[PDB]
Design a binder for these strands. Structure first.
Ligand SMILES: [Mn+2]
Ligand SMILES: [Mn+2]
Ligand SMILES: [Mn+2]
Ligand SMILES: [Mn+2]
Ligand SMILES: [Mn+2]
Ligand SMILES: [Mn+2]
Ligand SMILES: [N+]
Ligand SMILES: [N+]
Ligand SMILES: [Zn+2]
Ligand SMILES: [Zn+2]
Lengths: 184, 368, 368, 184
DNA sequence: TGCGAAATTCCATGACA
DNA sequence: ATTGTCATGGAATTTCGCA
DNA sequence: TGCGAAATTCCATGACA
DNA sequence: ATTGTCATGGAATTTCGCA
C-alpha cells in the first residue's frame, strides 16, 4: 500500500464544555493523521452547524480525503453527511463506546487539555485569546516517533517559533488546584 | 557693459562677437546686421532682465523663450543665459513635468521559504456584503499562498484580529506592507513586536513596492466578478471559495499552484496531482525543497533610451502626493543623501527632513 | 465514445492515439501509460464536461486549465477542447483583459485654413472664482489659436452665449466636440444649423479624438498654476492674460505662434517680430499663405509587435463605460459592420444597435 | 515710410444712447485703420471703466500700437491714460471740435448706424443680440478702395460668410418711419 | 536523421494599485 | 531603511510520432 | 576643405483628458 | 459617420567662425 500523507485523514472531536470565553464553550479539535498537525476552532455548541462553520474555514485551506470521528450527534447527522458528500470527503466512524481510535491523536488531545489547564490558571475565561498559542506549541512539538515537528512535516521547513512548546508534561500543585477550584 | 560695447563700436575685437559683422550705433543703441536682420545688442547688465521678461510671458522652455528674445536682440551665447534663468525659475521647476524616465525596475529574489515574508494589503471599499466592505489579503512571498479576510474597515484592530487567526498556523519572519494607516499605527507595531515579527514598509505612494500583493487584487476581483455575473454582488460568502480556488490554481510560468509550493502535495480538491503517491513523505518533502529552489526568476528589463538613475548630491524633486487643483505637482528641490539601491534613495528636504522614497516619485531637477 | 475506446483496447489503430503506447483497462476505465505516468482516457462524450469542470474551478486560461486536466486524464489534442470551451465561457469573455494592443494612431491633416474647424471642450470643475467653475476652450485647428470663456456650468446655454461672442469675429465650417451633454443637445444642434455650422462628434470615451483641444488643457492649467503659486487660486481674472500669453507663444516644432499663423503679423505685444516691416500687407499675406502650407506634419508611428486592426465580420467587444465594482469591464461580443478607417469602426450590438466606436475601446474576442 | 498694417492703429468711438437692450445703452466701436475690420462692444455708459472693460476683452486677442479717439471724457481721463501706458499703447487724439479724422472709419460708423436702423425695425430693444450679425456684415463687405473685405485683409483667407452684407445702402420708407417713431 | 502536427515555451499587453 | 508582478492567448520554438 | 564651439533639430517622456 | 497632440530639455546633428 501507498505511504501515509498529510490530508489523507483528519481526526475530529469536541473538547468541552469549558468556562465561557467570549461566548464560546467548546473547541473543535482537528488533527491531521500523518503529520500530527493540529487545528483548533472555538464554538458555542457541539452541533452540526458549529462543526460545518468551523470546517468551512479549515476546508478553505485544505480538504481531507477522510474525516474520522466518534458517533457524536454533530458528526452523525444527515446534514453533516451531506456537507461531507458535497466536498468528496469520506466520513469514517469509530464504533459506539470505542471512541478512541488513534493514540497519536489521543496524545494530542491530552496535550491540549494539559496546555489549557496550565495557561488558564487565574484566567479561566481567557482561552479564546490563547488558542493560537496552544496551536503553535502543539505544532512545534518534536515527535519522538516521527523525528520531526508537525510544522516540519506539513511545510518541509524549520519554523520561526521552534521553542513554542514549554510544556513540563505534568500538572504542578497550583495548576491542579486551579482546575479543582474551577469545578468547585 | 557699455565699456565692452564701446571697443566693439570702434572696430576692436571682443571674444564672442564674430569679427566678420558690422557693429553700428543707432538711436543710442548698439546694433548688428545679422543674416536674419538687424538686432539690438544690449549691454551685459541688461541681459538677465530681458531673459526674465521674455520667459515670464508664458513661462516657456528654452527654445520658445529664445525665439521671443531673438525677435529683437542678439548677443553671444543667448541660450546659456536662457537656461540659467530656467534653472532659477521656481514656478517652472515645481510645475513642469519631467521628460526623463525612471531607471529599470528591480526584481527582488523570491523569499527562500514559506513564512519568510508576508505581503499584506486591503482591497476596497467593495459593495456592502453582510456589513463587510473590505478584504485583508495576505500573500506568502515564497509560495504565493494567499489568505483572505472580510473586514468592515481597513483598520489596525481588524488587521490584528485576522492575523491572530492566521498566525495560529505559523509566525512569519517579516511582514511587508504599504504605509496605510492600519499598518503604521503603534498598536500594530506592538502586536508585531510581541510576536518577534519584523515590519517592513514600502516607500510612500508606490504600490509596485507591494506588487506581489497588489497583483493579487486583480485575480481576486476578476474571479469574484465572474462568479457574480447576473447576480447581486454578494461576495462575502464567496471569499472562502475564491481563496481555495486561487491557492490551487497553476501559474503557467511556474507549473505549480501556491498550495503545492506550500505543502508539497495536493489536498482532496478536484484534479489533484498524483505524481508522488508512491513516494514517502520524507522523499516528497525532499522533492519539494528542490522544486522551491529552482523556480523561474525574472531579470531586470533594459533601461529605456532616456532614463535616469540617482547619484549622491544630485538635486531631485519629490512628487506632490495629492496635489490640489491648479497647484504644482512637484515639491521644491532637495538633495540625494543616500542611494539605497538604483531605485530607492534617501533625500533631504529644504525643511531638513530625511525621507526614503522611490525614484518613480522623483524627477531630477532640470538645467543643472 | 466507448466504441472508439473499444478498438483501442483490442490493439487496433485509431487516428490520434499514438500506436507506440499500451492502452489497458482497469477499474472499468481505459488507461494509458504515458511518460509522465498513468492517465485515464475518458470517452469522447465525457470530455466537454471534464474541460468545463477544470476550467470552472478558477475560470482559468488555456495552460492553467490544461495543467489541471492533465493531472488525471489524457486524450488526443486536449488543448483544442480547452480552447473551444474558453471561447464559449461568457463570464471569461466579458471579464478578462485584452492582451492585444490597438493599431497605431492616425495623424489627421491639419485643417487647411483658419476657421475650417474648431475643437471645443470644457475644463473643470476648478476652484470657484467669482462664482465661475469651468472654462470653455475653443481651438482653431489650422492655427492653434485658442479662445477661453469662464462659465458657471458645462452647459449648452453657456456654450451658446460664448460662441455667439466668438462667432462675431467669424463663422467656422465645422465644430468638433466630444459627446458631453453641452454639445449633443438639440438646442446646440439648432444653434449650429442656423449658422451653417457642421457639428462633428468624437467616438465615445475617446479624448484622443479631441486631442488638439485636450492637449491645450495642459498648457492652460500649467500657466494658471505658475501664476497662482503662493496665492489663492483666483483664476477668473487671469483667463484673458493666459489666452493672450499662449496665443503669442512659439511652438518649437512650428517656429510660429498661433497669433502669427492667424494674422500673419504680431500685434503690439512684447518681443513682437519685425521681419515683414518693409513688406506691404499683400506681400505679408502672400508669405503667410506659404508658411501655412509648409508646417510640419507628423506621421503615423510604427505598430507595436502585437497590435490588431479591425476587419469586417470580426467579433469584437466594447469597453463598458463606467463599470460598477465587481462587474465586467467588457460588453458581450458584437460584429464589425464597417471599417471607417483602421482606428474607427461601426459595430452591431447583440441588441441590434449601430455604434461608431474607437478601436481603443474594443478588444477582439479571444479563441475565434 | 513703412507700409500700413493691421494693429498699427485702432480708431475708437461711442455710438448711443440707443434704446435699452438687456441693460445696455451704448456701443463702443473699434475699427482697425489698415484693414477696416470692426469690433463692437455693448456698454451701459460711455465711461472710462466701460471702455477699459470692453478693451480688456479686445486686447486679450490683439493689442494696437496706437489708439485714436476724439476728446470724449471716457478717453481723456487719467485712468484711461494709465490703462494705455500699462499696455504700451500710444493714445492719439483729434483736436476738440474736429472729432472726425479718418473717412474710412466714418464710413464704417454710418454703415453701423444704417445697419442697426434696418435690423431694429419693430424690435428696438433687440440690438444686443444683433451685434454679431452687424459685425459679420461689416467685416465681409468688399472695399472698392482696398479691393478686399476686412476679413480677407485681417486673416488672408476667404470667409465662410461671404454674403453677410445685404445692405441696400439707403433707408426705405418703413425704415425711416421706425427711426422716426422711436424718437417720438 | 527529416517532415508535419502537437506540445511547450515565450512574451507583449494590461491591470492591480 | 529599501526593491513590481503575473494571467493571458497568439506566435515562436521545441518535441513527438512515424519512417 | 577641417576643427571646436554654438546653433538647431531631433525626439522620448509624460500629461491633457 | 470617423481620425491624438505637443511642451519639454538633454542628445544628436548641422552650421558657424575662422584658418
Ligand atoms: Mn467526542
Ligand atoms: Mn480524546
Ligand atoms: Mn494598500
Ligand atoms: Mn469634454
Ligand atoms: Mn465721440
Ligand atoms: Mn463718426
Ligand atoms: N534581493
Ligand atoms: N485626414
Ligand atoms: Zn518660469
Ligand atoms: Zn470562464
Amino acid at each position: 500500500d501507498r505511504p501515509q500523507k498529510p490530508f489523507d485523514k483528519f481526526f475530529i472531536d469536541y473538547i468541552g464544555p469549558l468556562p465561557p470565553s467570549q461566548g464560546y464553550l467548546y473547541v473543535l479539535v482537528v488533527v491531521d493523521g500523518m503529520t500530527g498537525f493540529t487545528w483548533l476552532y472555538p464554538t458555542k455548541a457541539p452541533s452540526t452547524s458549529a462543526t460545518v462553520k468551523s470546517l468551512n474555514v479549515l476546508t478553505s485551506i485544505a480538504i481531507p480525503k477522510v474525516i474520522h470521528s466518534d458517533q457524536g450527534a454533530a458528526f452523525t447527522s444527515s446534514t453533516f453527511a451531506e456537507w461531507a458528500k458535497e466536498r468528496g470527503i469520506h466520513l469514517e466512524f469509530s464504533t459506539p463506546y470505542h471512541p478512541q481510535s488513534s493514540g497519536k491523536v489521543e496524545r494530542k488531545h491530552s496535550d491540549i487539555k494539559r496546555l489549557l489547564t496550565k495557561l488558564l490558571v487565574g484566567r479561566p475565561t481567557k482561552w479564546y485569546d490563547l488558542l493560537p498559542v496552544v496551536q503553535l506549541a502543539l505544532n512545534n512539538t518534536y515527535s519522538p516517533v516521527l523525528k520531526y515537528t508537525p510544522h516540519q512535516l506539513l511545510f518541509g521547513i524549520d519554523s520561526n517559533t521552534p521553542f513554542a512548546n514549554q510544556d513540563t508534561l505534568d500538572l504542578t500543585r497550583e495548576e491542579e488546584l486551579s482546575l479543582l477550584q474551577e469545578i468547585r | 557693459l557699455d565699456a565692452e560695447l564701446d571697443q566693439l563700436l570702434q572696430g576692436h575685437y571682443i571674444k564672442g562677437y564674430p569679427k566678420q559683422y558690422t557693429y553700428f550705433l543707432e538711436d543710442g543703441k548698439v546694433k548688428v546686421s545679422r543674416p536674419e536682420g538687424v538686432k539690438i545688442i544690449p549691454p551685459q547688465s541688461d541681459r538677465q532682465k530681458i531673459v526674465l521678461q521674455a520667459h515670464n510671458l508664458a513661462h516657456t522652455g528654452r527654445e520658445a523663450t529664445l525665439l521671443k528674445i531673438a525677435n529683437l536682440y542678439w548677443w553671444p551665447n543667448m541660450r546659456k543665459d536662457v537656461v540659467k534663468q530656467l534653472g532659477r525659475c521656481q514656478q517652472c521647476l515645481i510645475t513642469n513635468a519631467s521628460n526623463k524616465a525612471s531607471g529599470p525596475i528591480l526584481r527582488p529574489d523570491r523569499p527562500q521559504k514559506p513564512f519568510d515574508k508576508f505581503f499584506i494589503d486591503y482591497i476596497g471599499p467593495l459593495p456592502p456584503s453582510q456589513g463587510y466592505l473590505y478584504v485583508l489579503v495576505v500573500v506568502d512571498g515564497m509560495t504565493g499562498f494567499t489568505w483572505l479576510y472580510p473586514t468592515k474597515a481597513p483598520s489596525t484592530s481588524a488587521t490584528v484580529k485576522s492575523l491572530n487567526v492566521l498566525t495560529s498556523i505559523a509566525i512569519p519572519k517579516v511582514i511587508h506592507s504599504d504605509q496605510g494607516a492600519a499598518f503604521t499605527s503603534s498598536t500594530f507595531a506592538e502586536w508585531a513586536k510581541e510576536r518577534g515579527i519584523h515590519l517592513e514598509f514600502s516607500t510612500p505612494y508606490h504600490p509596485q513596492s507591494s506588487g506581489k500583493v497588489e497583483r493579487k487584487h486583480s485575480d481576486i476581483k476578476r474571479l469574484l466578478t465572474k462568479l457574480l455575473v447576473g447576480r447581486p454582488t454578494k461576495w462575502y460568502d464567496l471569499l472562502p471559495v475564491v481563496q481555495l480556488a486561487l491557492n490551487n490554481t497553476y501559474s503557467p510560468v511556474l507549473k505549480y499552484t501556491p498550495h503545492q509550493l506550500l505543502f508539497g502535495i495536493d489536498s482532496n480538491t478536484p484534479f489533484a496531482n498524483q505524481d508522488t503517491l508512491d513516494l514517502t513523505r520524507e522523499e516528497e518533502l525532499s522533492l519539494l525543497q528542490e522544486i522551491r529552489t529552482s523556480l523561474y526568476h525574472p531579470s531586470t528589463p533594459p533601461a529605456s533610451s532616456r532614463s535616469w538613475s540617482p547619484v549622491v548630491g544630485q538635486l531631485v524633486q519629490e512628487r506632490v502626493a495629492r496635489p490640489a487643483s491648479l497647484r504644482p505637482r512637484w515639491h521644491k528641490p532637495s538633495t540625494v543623501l543616500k542611494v539605497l539601491n538604483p531605485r530607492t534613495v534617501v533625500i533631504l528636504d529644504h525643511l531638513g527632513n530625511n525621507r526614503t522614497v522611490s525614484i518613480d516619485n522623483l524627477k531630477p531637477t532640470s538645467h543643472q
